[PDB]
Write a protein that binds this DNA or RNA. Structure first.
Length: 74
DNA sequence: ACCGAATGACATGCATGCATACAGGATGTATATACCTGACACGTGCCTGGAGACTAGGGAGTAACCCCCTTGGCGGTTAAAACGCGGGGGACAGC
């Protein structure tokens, strides 16, 4: 029951509205605990952020690459 | 509000990532084989030093006593141990 990775990621940030930006783990724990994702879930989430930040709609407030915190950037 | 055109959602086609098992094939290792001899094993001296027997005289082992200092006990106070806890920052994991 997993649609395209665009949707839960933005939903997860909406769940915990950190103004400083959500740290990489905060999304990772919730979406796997809440929904059901494939055996290689964590790998897909990391590059999901990586491609998502390249699209520019999300802002990494702290850290470099995937290791930091990210923000919806409205 | 259903009918079309259009479009988002749903369902799957397509391509890919990734894992995995293999089989190869290469290399290193173990086997498998002769010869080889420095080198352990006697072997033969050869003597000196360990044993026998000797005396002598002190140090260890006894008894004997003692007293102190160890152990025991015996309240009183109170300083320190025990407990609760609120939390923050140190460990730690991940990229």
């Amino acid at each position: 029951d997993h649609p395209k990775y665009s949707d839960m990621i933005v939903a997860a940030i909406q769940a915990e509205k950190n103004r400083a930006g959500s740290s990489r783990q905060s999304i990772q724990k919730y979406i796997k605990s809440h929904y059901k994702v494939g055996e290689n879930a964590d790998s897909q989430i990391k590059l999901s952020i990586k491609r998502l930040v390249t699209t520019g709609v999300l802002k990494q407030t702290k850290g470099v690459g995937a290791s930091g915190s990210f923000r919806l950037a409205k």
